[PDB]
């Protein structure tokens, strides 16, 4: 049972800022353990390449790959490619990665390979959903607990269970609607709710989840490493639709 | 001096959720007493008809009639029994009649899950915590109302245990209006800015409970301890039928 | 419905410090109303004699006599008018007489700066926040008292706006005792442990105000909203002379 | 993934009061899950015998043993005795893992303010404690002797740092164990424990359960630490059934 | 070292409401001292002329100038105009130090909810703001053009980090200045300021003073930042005396 | 206007933990500025000697010397010498250093030269008096504000003004009574209060000031440097009366 030195990110005590030297000297297990209760780890000034990034992330579990799989599709390059959604340049609204049985994701790793001309756009943001669900007005929590949420990729509709109870956390899976004007790769709905009701629900929940007690915004710089426990937080990418911006991240996903 | 089991609704400890059996076994006076300090009572899964509803509420005092039990069924063409917003108000200060307790029972609710809420505001805690420039206006300025379906409405009436609030907010743009407020010496710009800013203060989750209705819900409010609002439900598919009762003592 | 200017005493917003001029210009009913939600009023630098004191307090209701104005002058040999502790209690539940407002005026205070406080406790906020095992006892167990200078004293009497508390703490070891409490089904060990732990809860600064007396101080308490205590002042050099008035309505 | 209805015990939101009907209708896994984040579960008005108690608890994992412990207040004994059991978690003096502890009240008479089982939210307390208290817990070696071996204070399970600690018995209470901290004098160790204990007993972190017939207390042993307060009055009947499980 | 009696303005304990008699009886140094930790002083019901106002303020230090500014709501002007003055501290566009600002109300008619002078507790706000907002304030270069030069956001005085910042004017309000942040696009700078402004306007950090005849507002210019809300209704008389001092 | 990296010590945001490398690279002025609002600075693993300690502290102002002065009595060695009070082994109760006109002290520096056999005794403790005075029951604050406090060194009695208003802080000077059994070098009294009242006042104020929101306890190790802004905090030494303990600190005092 080893200890890493860290500082909290949130005023509530959530999140972990870790010095690069303390991170690199830490055992994989010490950070994986810390992620469970801190939700996310932020390390700056780590100058590595994609292979080293791969050696760091692959130690945390079985690589979840981004006509089936042979372990080759490991590192996803999110480089802001025109005409794409996930690897594109617009918003990716509140979601958690992966899916449910073998497609489950426990840890997500995002490394900044190259960031230029961007200072206040394109953040990866992170939400402490368990503290948020514990504190939200019961009228918001009741919908998340009792209603059937369905998603369509843009009878195309399928159910996404909002809460999967792992004991230590209720793992959250949800897919917020992309804001108007943003290229959408998915679309949510709530069974028995109208479009008006669903739209208003998501807007009010989104506003609640983005209050600074639960919300962390990460503005990217070269060398940043953002690791998330995918069952403990949900996340979002803010838009970066300016052609002068260079924003290249490497993405890794693991599970046990 | 009996005790009813309850759980608080708000995080501040205000509000009371009471189980339907506990509610029915409790004496009228036990619930009536709890209402004064908790402001509102929420009972779910209570299966009663309109006659039983009358028998429950009429025990709380003298029935304040309208011109017995009001049927708010969402009629196309009306205001109070219409399908739109009824903004922040307290009951009985327009057609000047003392109202102490307000009762709302859901007879039938269909096709509505995130519209048509009855909302409730803890005004005493909000007045205690609000910025001085907001409270200043409420305490010092003359507030007047005109019916639209000009007279002075005293904002605070000190009953000791609470400063009973009587106020009538402006209806949101596009909602059919039953009243219209004004503040003496304030321009229209100023009054509108005032009410928008105060309304946003009052709707913060520390003071504000939103009730989304289901068949068998009973909402009881102490009319001197809270103010309330109906949110719009202007979609023809919605069935929202509520029974309303109003009581007072002399 | 007039307003008196005031500043809160506690950090929670409870209590009311009122300037002596503001107090004298205010109507009786304005102070009487504020007392219900603030629990207590503190006025400093008020220069009145005993006749004027009577005229101020008698306006609040019907005088509850003792056997008019009580003179608590620290007499060697007595208890209530003695020089020792009077532990946490509310007024009028031993010699069963309703007391709504209690008034204490300092006629003369000399050689005392950190003894002989009258202390005041916000019981409603404390009951709302106390550990369940403490509140459990207060709500469910039978509390009894015996005069010593056995009968049931109902801990809570629900008046709606407050649960009026009637309780009589044990006197600290070495203080002359006017009463003695017991809890039915509790051993002496258990009761003593209970009261020590509850007393420490009630004395935390969030709920507890300690008043150190000065010439011209006036302390008014709403007897249903607070409980109070006198701390010992057993040093012969101390002059602590207070006038006491007690009022109630039916 | 079912939901049991519950109300929190602490103002922080920790603990779960669960109605007896709701408890009995819930899947084992639902409660077992809830315990991880809530720390402890309190059910009142349950009327079961020892066999049913066994059926309830054994479903949570492997029984740690000789299965049900009858803590009845037997004289001349320690754990099964009538005095204090100070702050601890179960299963670190024997070297056997305990995940869940279950306590049931089969008979309580003549006790209203004594013999409590108390529970402490150790993860919130560690996150909020003064740093000079935390430093000792994290960096010093704590040893225990059964009435000398190293017991690690924290074992990092990810979701919680499981606490294994054995507090000293108050004077006058018969000790079943005795702690020490390597490098500290007897003065220093006593002071450290007195100060830490008072921090742990603050109402934000501390629940006291006074027992009544039919109460069931379930604790997740990695998430909380616990204590038994003395009940050395001979008129008291305090008879509890005890069950322990782990994976 | 005298004491003036006061009541705090904010729930945090910042600000000082001081009765007019108590204000007039207090030594200058007592108020000047109080302002450092309280940020701002509010006195109501003071009936003075411009000469007495000058006597009061000039005693606090050297007058920064042409001594008293008559902000009367003159049309076709900016500072002395009728529209918004966004968040700023005084004296960084001219290069002259301002320690204390004094504002007195000589005539107010027909305005009850407009033309406020507002005050912001910047040190509490910086200590509590999201880190992505603070990082910009601490590490980026902010420039201003008077309607381009570097204005340092923080100047460390020890007891406070004095803030010099010039917010952008809302659209439709005549701009007396214009800000920029080096390395940020126009989109980014607008977003940063919109988000920061809303954080600064939260009631924990923000006092709004609606003016009445006889009000005196004194601000310590190193401890707070301030704003004037628009009053572009022609029926309004808003006439303030303004004084500024420094050491 | 430079910035040092630091972490708060208190949950309220008070105090500054500074990495040794960040401290040593910082300009004197940056730490002196920070002390004003953080009250105290804590640096660990600084391995210096008494001359270097002197070069560090003397840059902060004019050396306050511990038959008058010529600048030679600069560094005080508190080594737990038997039969002494200040440089002895018992408690030094709540006080601030120095006095009032030329004997005023602005910054105090305490460096640990040698610490052995002590893990939970002999702490230097630090109190955030301004937050404490702002939050205390008015009955405690009223005594500090309105009564005359006098001190005697053990018509030997002299007045100590509790509050000296510097604007940014009310500088506190107070001398708590030494606990029973501890060798006392001073004795307080309050004019018009009896011994009983004074004793009870100090006990209740002391309990209030020692609540963790205001109180920091420093357990010494080799290489620790504790710097205090003497106007912003008050402090205390807890007893270390065990003969096996080695506790040698170096002390420096400066003022402007
Ligand atoms: O680009 C980012 O900021 C993260 C993208 C993301 O959330 C994903 O690929 O699932
Ligand atoms: O329909 C509702 O939600 C409440 C209507 C109401 O407040 C009233 O009739 O007084
Ligand atoms: O003397 C006092 O401080 C109060 C005495 C008292 O509470 C009473 O007489 O009821
Ligand atoms: O008697 C109790 O309260 C249970 C005590 C306990 O923790 C044990 O026996 O392991
Ligand atoms: O008009 C005001 O409110 C004062 C505005 C101000 O800050 C200035 O003139 O420098
Ligand atoms: O020895 C210490 O811990 C500090 C001693 C001290 O406070 C002093 O010399 O004034
Ligand atoms: Fe993602
Ligand atoms: Fe209504
Ligand atoms: Fe009394
Ligand atoms: Fe145990
Ligand atoms: Fe200005
Ligand atoms: Fe010292």
mmCIF file of C-alpha atoms and ligand atoms in Angstrom, chain D residues 79 85-86 88-91 101 103 117 166 177 219 221 226-228 242 244, ligand 10:
data_model
loop_
_atom_site.group_PDB
_atom_site.id
_atom_site.type_symbol
_atom_site.label_atom_id
_atom_site.label_comp_id
_atom_site.label_asym_id
_atom_site.label_seq_id
_atom_site.Cartn_x
_atom_site.Cartn_y
_atom_site.Cartn_z
ATOM 1 C CA UNK D 79 -15.360 -9.312 23.711
ATOM 2 C CA UNK D 85 -14.517 -2.410 23.206
ATOM 3 C CA UNK D 86 -12.632 0.686 21.898
ATOM 4 C CA UNK D 88 -11.456 -0.929 15.909
ATOM 5 C CA UNK D 89 -12.277 -2.730 12.754
ATOM 6 C CA UNK D 90 -12.864 -6.498 12.845
ATOM 7 C CA UNK D 91 -10.412 -9.189 11.872
ATOM 8 C CA UNK D 101 -20.224 -7.221 10.191
ATOM 9 C CA UNK D 103 -25.295 -7.233 14.656
ATOM 10 C CA UNK D 117 -22.492 0.196 19.373
ATOM 11 C CA UNK D 166 -6.919 -0.949 17.659
ATOM 12 C CA UNK D 177 -5.651 -5.837 23.423
ATOM 13 C CA UNK D 219 -21.450 -2.404 8.912
ATOM 14 C CA UNK D 221 -15.854 -3.231 7.923
ATOM 15 C CA UNK D 226 -16.557 0.880 15.509
ATOM 16 C CA UNK D 227 -16.784 0.685 19.186
ATOM 17 C CA UNK D 228 -18.844 -0.797 21.976
ATOM 18 C CA UNK D 242 -23.117 -11.466 15.530
ATOM 19 C CA UNK D 244 -19.243 -11.765 9.796
HETATM 20 FE FE1 LIG G 10 -15.839 -5.460 16.275
#
